[PDB]
Scaffold this active site. Sequence first.
Site, PDB file in Angstrom:
ATOM      1  N   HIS A  27     -56.120  62.605 -30.735  1.00  0.00           N
ATOM      2  CA  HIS A  27     -55.460  63.460 -29.756  1.00  0.00           C
ATOM      3  C   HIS A  27     -54.084  62.882 -29.452  1.00  0.00           C
ATOM      4  CE1 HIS A  27     -55.201  66.385 -26.466  1.00  0.00           C
ATOM      5  NE2 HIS A  27     -54.696  65.408 -25.733  1.00  0.00           N
ATOM      6  N   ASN A  54     -49.359  65.310 -21.422  1.00  0.00           N
ATOM      7  CA  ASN A  54     -50.657  65.504 -22.055  1.00  0.00           C
ATOM      8  C   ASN A  54     -50.993  66.984 -21.988  1.00  0.00           C
ATOM      9  OD1 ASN A  54     -53.255  65.415 -23.071  1.00  0.00           O
ATOM     10  ND2 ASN A  54     -53.913  63.689 -21.796  1.00  0.00           N
ATOM     11  N   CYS A  82     -52.755  69.348 -30.646  1.00  0.00           N
ATOM     12  CA  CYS A  82     -52.303  68.167 -29.916  1.00  0.00           C
ATOM     13  C   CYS A  82     -50.950  67.687 -30.430  1.00  0.00           C
ATOM     14  CB  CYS A  82     -53.343  67.053 -30.026  1.00  0.00           C
ATOM     15  SG  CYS A  82     -55.033  67.564 -29.635  1.00  0.00           S
TER      16      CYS A  82
END
EC number: 3.4.22.-
Length: 267
Positions: free
Chosen positions: A162, A181, A226
């Site tokens: 990720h 994020n 991601c």
Amino acid sequence: SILEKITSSPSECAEHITNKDSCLSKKIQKELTSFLQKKETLGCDSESCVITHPAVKAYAQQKGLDLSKELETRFKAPGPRNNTGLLTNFNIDETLQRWAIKYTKFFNCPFSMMDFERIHYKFNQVDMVKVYKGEELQYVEGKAVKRPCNTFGCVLNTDGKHWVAIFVDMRGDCWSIEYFNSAGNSPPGPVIRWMERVKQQLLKIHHTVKTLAVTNIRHQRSQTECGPYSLFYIRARLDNVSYTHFISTRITDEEMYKFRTHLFRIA
């Protein structure tokens, strides 16, 4: 944070070459005009397909030309342009390396893992004052380069694989150290301590330095974007798109599917 608000485009030419049509140099362009004017014979729709066709590679190389050099430069790095494949470590480094070419004051820190407090990574070894003063090493176009940078960018793995983005803005009067994020989760301890160490470092040469976690919204609902999310944050922040957009409005994974066509050349 919409795809049209930044400077990238679905073109496969490298971002730094401001060429109206071809991504190829002037020498290569007319040296391969026979194959360029009939792409759909070699089975090609683009220029990167042509100068990678084994027969075109035979002609130009038996004629002295260097088509591999023409492919590393002038073209974006190969990768999952039209599919949802996970972004490798090379899809990210080669992206920030090419973004160090046009963006002459951007520092392309190589990808780091979440173990940088116990394993050597360039991310944990840089000194942001040396980055700003131009005393840290960065790899641009292949050579080692030390140059003053007002921006710092890195993409880390939170360990599946990720990707999260780190961006340090040292351009305006307020210097910001940002953690993004797409999954909307807080940065772990090491990154939480890394940003604090960069704050104290940057408070040496500037009076205002703030750390911020852009972790408010769970933008990503897919399992594959991601990478595109992390690279898009750095590119948008480089184009002076405020982080407050990523704080307030969700960017869908469908815009990250579309952003993949801005990132890579199929290969």
